[PDB]
Amino acid sequence: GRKKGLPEFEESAPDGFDPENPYKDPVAMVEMREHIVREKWIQIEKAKILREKVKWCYRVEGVNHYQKCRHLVQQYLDSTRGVGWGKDHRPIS
């Protein structure tokens, strides 16, 4: 019982959750928890797409890849600072 298209749950924000008292509205806390992962997966996926950007850049330019991909290398290295749950430097979400 679904439309054939991709689902869309919600994007803006969960209004019920208040950071000052995280355990105050249990109904809205799960919404915040799922929204966190649904927004972090966006960053993970854009990191993946910029990774393929870099990979095809190295696969096209040739020997001059130390001067024609630095604008994307700096866009990759900073994207690994707070991506997913992979290193002890957790992102400040």
Binding site: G62, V63, N64, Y66, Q67
Partner: protein
């Protein structure tokens, strides 16, 4: 002797790093003729000996530069 092939002509050419020394302007014709000629050692020599002597000159000037230090170190001792 000073180099002349710089910026676009040096970067567009697929010459690898490390062989991009002072006198490497004539490597483009060498690799253009060598690549089409099946890389035969016995078919491409017109454009090779010039590069060999360019590297010869670079090595001998490089050791000439150290000659001065070698003959001046006697002052310290």
């Amino acid at each position: 002797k000073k180099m002349i092939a710089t910026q676009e002509e040096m970067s567009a050419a697929k010459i690898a790093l490390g062989s991009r020394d002072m006198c490497a302007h004539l490597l483009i014709p060498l690799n253009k003729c060598r690549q089409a000629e099946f890389y035969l050692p016995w078919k491409c020599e017109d454009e090779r000996h010039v590069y060999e002597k360019c590297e010869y000159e670079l090595v001998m000037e490089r050791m000439l530069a150290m000659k001065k230090i070698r003959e001046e170190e006697a002052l310290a001792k």
